[PDB]
């Protein structure tokens, strides 16, 4: 299957030239699932949050986008309470040129620029749009909860 080969290329890219503030590694049992971590960007309410993710790749990953979700609890307007992420990079209009490091960089950059319109978490977006202090307080709360795993 060509899907596993491009996954091996993705692993080779992430092993030696991983993006700053991002790490990833598949289970040595099978490459079909990945564990990735996005360190919260500086000058952001999500700063230093070691937010974890689980990457689920289909058997036709070169064309079918992966299933990306958040394991550590996240409070973001464009992140579901389930942990699912709505990104136009994901789901529809996903391009076959996306290295795993590119997806992780996209999600990391999504932190500082949420979309209050078309909310995925209605409470999160409403707090972000009108209630910046409460929103940043809750983001700090979820960051502290994220640190607890270790």
């Amino acid at each position: 299957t060509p899907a596993r080969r491009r996954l091996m290329r993705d692993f080779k890219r992430m092993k030696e030239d991983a993006p700053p503030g991002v790490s990833a590694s598949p289970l040595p049992d099978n490459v079909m699932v990945w564990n990735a971590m996005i360190i919260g960007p500086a000058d952001t309410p999500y700063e230093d949050g070691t937010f974890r993710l689980l990457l689920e790749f289909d058997e036709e990953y070169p064309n079918k986008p992966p299933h990306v979700k958040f394991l550590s609890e996240m409070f973001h307007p464009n992140v579901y309470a389930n942990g699912e992420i709505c990104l136009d990079i994901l789901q529809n209009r996903w391009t076959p040129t996306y290295d795993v490091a590119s997806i992780l960089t996209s999600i990391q950059s999504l932190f500082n620029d949420p979309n209050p319109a078309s909310p995925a978490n209605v409470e999160a977006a409403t707090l972000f749009k009108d209630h910046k202090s409460q929103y940043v307080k809750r983001v700090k709360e979820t960051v502290e909860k994220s640190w607890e795993d270790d």
Binding site: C86, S118, P119, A120
Partner: peptide, 4 residues
């Protein structure tokens, strides 16, 4: 005068 006028008045997902």
């Amino acid at each position: 005068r006028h008045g997902k």
